[PDB]
């Protein structure tokens, strides 16, 4: 028995129910509306035809009432269907909440030089922040906010390493950004900053958090004031 | 109950409600098209006339084969619905550029200025972003939601042997956002390692830029000026 | 009204509406072939036997199943009908649309010397029952996209790759980046997806490429053949041919 | 008849026949609660210048407010709904045979440490070109809420190409499904003998498996530790 | 009309109005099961001070699904199918070292090969085993091409393998074998399907015995030349 609450949950048998309860309940409902206002009121009282086909055409005819009785009952439907869109497409816009995801990898921490000139820029940007180890494990990571919370965009918070070799990295990481992105549309901003662009750690330092910030900065114009980099467009 | 606002909107209980709801309207309605149409008088037609002791199943095959043909001209309906649809597709819905902020030469305008010309039923549309490596998630959204049934990917690549991987980076989830969604992206790079001096560069370019969109053209409405090109 | 159309567009809700009511007519269709063909037919409860009267007799109380199951059995044997049906309709369906056509050969705007032609004659050679769709493009990083619809919107369940890389040890990548595409487009749908590259380092000279070039379109479009139809012969050809 | 089976097994008409008939119950279920408790008391005992009118608008919000009782059991039923023991739960490693070092326990140790109630959860496989169906799977038909890429590279110029491979696999996976693969990830070319690698090795083993912990229950440590430090490793 | 036969197939329309009208029928008969069958025979706290009478059949009905599944899972199990894919392009039949070495390790395998020309195809075709027919796992037995430049393929190839592994939830064994492995025919043909067996080796293991595996643990196992210890 203690194995069965397992199949409930991984298929999620309550959540279909629900939902369709509400359809029957839900559509049940939208119809009185049209049933019950909407048509007697909308319609009553408002062809002059005799013609020249029959009788067979009399089917015709028949078939023509057929059509004209649907479209009463139809148009209206139509029209209820209208005014239900124009309340969907009512709601809220662009005043969202923008989350930022870090590195304990990374050595540099920059969710703050950038948190700033963001929440500057506009006080009403509630932010989120997520942290994992791995310079390779921020993507679940960033997806799973942009997949479970508006996150309307993410900033990619970190540091690559040195030698030839760990080129890879910074490679392998962005195909699978790029991929979060497209496996949902929201450009997450890779924050990447490597660590071969100095010559001692104050060099470094400076470089990051600066960079940090024209890119929270960027953020605010891909979310709030699009025409500007139209401009910027050398 | 500022907490049960929340549940209706997640969920979205509204559009299924309508979208069900509709159907028996929208399936009613298509019903007596043929309930009392093509039948009623198409059936004049293919008696058929006259397979596999004590013996109703004929008399009952005749208004089998009379269903299948109200059900088989339902769906021959519905098929011509879909080419109708499909002139839609004879017909355009328009092209689409995205632009960098990281650029150092603006190409948008030398193409949109030969992409009207060679047709001026074209309507542009406009969006830019400031890293190459960002294209995407955009050249995916206009073709994800405002038609543009073409878009050209306008950007420039970086120097240094090092930044060759950008190209190669950026291309892939250019393909990938291309295999999203059954749109041809061309991909409009020009990598900065093809001149001498500023000027050399300059017109390397916005040439190239009109190249291409050329071709947009060509992918649009002219393909076989492209097949005989082959090769 | 027109905004309206427009919403009414994009959505698809049409399709919805048509395999709605299809379903119904589908539906109260093969009903009919059950209700008054294949059931009003196999109602004896002869031949076969078996039934059950397993010493009914004071229990105190021990039934429930023999109503039941006479009930039950009689609504087992509806269903049962049914279900043979739909076997036979099936089998139908299979033995029956090889009926076939269409193959499809993407090219070029890129290549230098035309392959398509030099493997679409192999190919109706091989059989003439081949309907072939021809359909270019202008950068070889392109094809990826189109030979993706040719597999998607129109039947072609193969395609020819026929397209041509280029020279210098920088344009090497192109090849492996449109590879991708071609796997991810293979790998998008069931459909193989020969891939009709040859670079243009593969010789000395203009003419001696061009001998190259044709020769492979020409190979692939064999494979495709048999690739298409004869699986056995490739089966075999393991190991070198 | 031995062809029949056939039928059955791949249209699946018995995971229908079971959901749909589900359906029936599980919705006259959540019905029942409604019909009989949520109404039977929460709702009861609480001329026109006309023309059709004042009996239409008057039905109309009696047909709106059976809508809004069906919207209170809705809303119940999703109450109900707990996010009770949520993280606690299961963890799982996958491991090598093409390895050298039984990384393996090493983790396992750290980790039933740190916490016992962890049920963990093993399984293999030959090379380190495969880790990924199975990763996939676990995450995917047990919890696992995470899991960990126990498994080791290799030190030709060349077998580079299969961290690279794997990992671009790897990133899939977890995009393919929003949990954590925690890479564990062992270059042989890390070394100057046996002995040598051998440490690095178990080492890094327990390092993730440090941060597995974290990643489960404690997150705000890696916010803190952030920006500062730990290079997993050596 | 000659145009129509083809939306009926694209779409098989034929295949779900059977399925659906089963539903009804396969669901009816349980019930009258339950209905007729299991229920006529048989007949929390507190506060002073019917929906559990609901809960009470409700509750008999959940018990039965689970008895389904059990009955389901009992046709059948983890005991089968293979299918082998491989070369053409290949300089050595691998096939058979490991198709001989698999029916060994025990007869209930029964093997389905079939195999394509270029490299790079194999994934659609493997990826169409794993997804129609029960290929509960699948080798390819590959081979590349020479040059410090072909080696692109086995990557690219690979990745896809991958992913076809990935799309869908059944080990791939990428069984690839580089020429530049040896210094001429015949040391390479030895490398070659030796290599093979030994897969297939591990994939009786993958498929029944996963103990065997465990153990190896960090212990050696290194396929190819000289196994290579712990
Ligand atoms: C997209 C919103 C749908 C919400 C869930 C209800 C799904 C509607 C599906 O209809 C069903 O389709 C079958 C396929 O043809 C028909 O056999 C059947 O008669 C019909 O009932």
């Not at 279909?16 to 019950?36: C, E, P, Q, R, W």
């Not at 055409?57 to 139509?78: K, M, P, Q, R, T």
């Not at 005014?83 to 923008?98: C, D, G, P």
């Not at 690559?160 to 962005?174: I, L, N, Y």
């Amino acid at each position: 028995f203690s194995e069965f609450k397992e199949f409930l949950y991984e298929y999620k048998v309550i959540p279909l129910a629900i939902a369709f309860i509400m359809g029957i309940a839900s559509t049940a409902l939208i119809k009185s509306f049209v049933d019950n206002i909407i048509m007697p009121i909308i319609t009553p009282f408002v062809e002059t035809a005799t013609v020249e086909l029959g009788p067979i055409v009399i089917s015709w005819g028949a078939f023509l009432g057929e059509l004209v009785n649907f479209i009463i009952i139809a148009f209206a439907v139509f029209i209820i269907a209208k005014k239900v869109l124009q309340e969907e497409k009512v709601e809220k816009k662009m005043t969202k909440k923008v989350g930022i995801v870090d590195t304990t990898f990374a050595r540099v921490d920059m969710a703050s030089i950038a948190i700033k000139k963001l929440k500057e820029l506009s006080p009403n940007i509630k932010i989120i922040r997520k942290t994992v180890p791995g310079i390779k494990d921020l993507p679940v990571a960033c997806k799973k906010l942009l997949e479970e919370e508006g996150c309307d965009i993410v900033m990619a918070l970190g540091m690559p390493g040195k030698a030839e070799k760990d080129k890879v990295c910074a490679h392998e990481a962005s195909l699978g950004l790029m991929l979060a992105q497209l496996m949902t549309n929201k450009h997450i901003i890779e924050v990447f900053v490597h660590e071969d662009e100095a010559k001692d750690d104050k060099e470094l330092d400076w470089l990051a958090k600066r960079r940090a910030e024209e890119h929270a900065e960027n953020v605010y114009y891909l979310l709030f004031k699009p025409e500007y980099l139209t401009r910027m467009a050398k």
